[PDB]
């Protein structure tokens, strides 16, 4: 199918107390893959997957240099943000970006990304893709014009389709036996009746990668229904991820009701009803 | 493979 | 240079002797720093770099030190030099973060190690 | 070794066309570099580049062809002021990774 690389990072400033804190961590689809925490005593960045203790010390010096340079970068932006917004020194801020690449089921480049934040809200992004910039508020505007003139989004996309699809490529392929996993989901189902006269039933899906998923609901005259009951995606810990959902129904009946499942893993299908 | 380029201050 | 100045420019200087090397930069604001080195033959091999102030990084085993009380300060120094040492020094600077990456040299500062 | 670039001293008459080639083996690479260092002075950006293509400035023209790990520098109508090392660049890792520079003599 579909996969991408993504890069995301986090500065927060301490006034009083320190040096921002910088967190950068890297995802091939939706597995963890290297990390970079200005906290840990390492000061490195660090392996998160199997497949990517592979790459030589080289690989390890570069990517430490790059995060410490991006690091470096929000650090003075947090500074020049406290201008254009007149904040206090006191008060602590978060900088955020988050960029990648996503490819086709053909590996080839589909579309790039680079979006930039501040105290949670949009700032700055990358059109989709162009060279054209989307700003926020009279602060980004000047952003904006600064990246304009130095050409920011030339640079960026020099990467984003050239250097992090090839390297999304060399990390499918080394880490084929993770990332083209694809775990079909174990299906079971629990029933709760809400102190008679009605009743719930419960959809369980378990162990699947990756996290896309759909589950349904449906019923005898007519298909669909938007009075469901469905949990966000949750990861297990072990790799994998859990969902489930539930609908209320009347304790009459009963197995009238029908759920189906949708991922990638699944060939076919998968739809489960209530047995005694 | 982090970017190596087009990183600037805002 | 107007953006990156070095100095001194050239010395002479007798085993077992201490080294300074001083680079100051204007024009720019917490730019990445760095000592190149370019010895027997061209081709510049990197000693030290620096995303900002007070941080060091060196990038081989080594004889000499860097350091950067100041933003647009940067120094390499020696406590006492051996032959190997004698090379033609670079100080150079680039852009805050990771930008076209294109470096400023300064004017260079040679030194001789002579027995 | 990592970035490859032919010795000099290649010779061109004046007026010719200089040709530079440079070989890179770190497909991490993302951008790529001409310094020119005369004699005694420390080296000089003629020109930088980071997109399969010819970049044109001038009597300089860079070349990038990121499948084959090639960059090149031309120089047309070379003078004799153009004689100097050639530094060809990598921006690879975090910094800059260089060859150990090709001498060019154009002959009057």
């Known amino acids: 199918g579909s996969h991408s690389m993504r890069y995301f990072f986090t500065s927060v400033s301490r006034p009083g107390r320190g040096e921002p804190r910088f967190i950068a961590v890297g995802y091939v689809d939706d597995t963890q893959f290297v990390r970079f925490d200005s906290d840990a005593a390492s000061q490195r960045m660090e392996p998160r997957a199997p497949w990517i203790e592979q790459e030589g010390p080289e690989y390890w010096d570069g990517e430490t240099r790059k995060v410490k340079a991006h690091s470096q970068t929000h650090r003075v932006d947090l500074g020049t943000l406290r201008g254009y917004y007149n904040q206090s020194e006191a008060g602590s801020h978060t900088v955020q970006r988050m960029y990648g690449c996503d490819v086709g089921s053909d590996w080839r480049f589909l579309r790039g990304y680079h979006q930039y934040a501040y105290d949670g809200k949009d700032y700055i992004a990358l059109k989709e893709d162009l060279r054209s910039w989307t700003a926020a508020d009279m602060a980004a505007q000047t952003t904006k014009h600064k990246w304009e003139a130095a050409h920011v989004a030339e640079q960026l996309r020099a990467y984003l389709e050239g250097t992090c699809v090839e390297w999304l490529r060399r990390y499918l392929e080394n880490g084929k036996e993770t990332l083209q996993r694809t775990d079909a989901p174990k299906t079971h189902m629990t029933h709760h009746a809400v102190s008679d006269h009605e009743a719930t039933l419960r959809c369980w899906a378990l162990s699947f990668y990756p996290a896309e998923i759909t589950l349904t609901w449906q019923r005898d005259g007519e298909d669909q229904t938007q009075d469901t009951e469905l949990v966000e995606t949750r990861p297990a810990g072990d790799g994998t991820f859990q969902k489930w959902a539930a609908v209320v129904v009347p304790s009459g009946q009963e197995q009238r009701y029908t759920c189906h499942v949708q991922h990638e893993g699944l060939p076919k299908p998968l739809t489960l009803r209530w047995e005694p | 493979e982090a970017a190596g380029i087009g990183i600037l201050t805002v | 240079s107007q953006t990156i100045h070095q100095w001194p420019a050239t010395l002479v200087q007798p085993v077992g002797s201490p080294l300074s090397l001083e680079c100051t930069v204007e024009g720019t604001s917490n730019p990445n720093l760095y000592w190149y080195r370019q010895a027997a033959g061209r081709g510049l091999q990197l000693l030290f770099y620096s995303v900002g102030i007070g941080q060091i990084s060196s990038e081989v085993p080594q004889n000499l030190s860097a350091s950067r009380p100041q933003d647009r300060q940067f120094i390499l120094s020696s406590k006492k030099l051996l032959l190997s040492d004698s090379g033609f020094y670079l100080c150079?600077?680039?852009?805050?973060?990771?930008?076209?990456?294109?470096?400023?040299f300064g004017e260079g500062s040679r030194l001789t190690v002579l027995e | 070794q990592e970035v490859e670039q032919n010795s000099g001293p290649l010779s061109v008459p004046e007026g010719a066309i200089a040709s530079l080639n440079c070989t890179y083996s770190d497909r991490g690479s993302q951008s790529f570099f001409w310094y020119r260092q005369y004699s005694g002075k420390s080296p000089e950006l003629i020109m930088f580049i980071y997109s399969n293509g010819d970049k044109e400035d001038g009597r300089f023209t860079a070349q990038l062809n990121k499948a084959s790990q090639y960059v090149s520098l031309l120089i047309r109508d070379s003078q004799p002021s153009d004689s100097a090392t050639y530094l060809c660049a990598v921006n690879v890792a975090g910094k800059s990774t260089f060859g150990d520079g090709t001498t060019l003599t154009v002959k009057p």
């Open positions: 150079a600077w680039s852009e805050t973060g990771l930008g076209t990456g294109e470096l400023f």
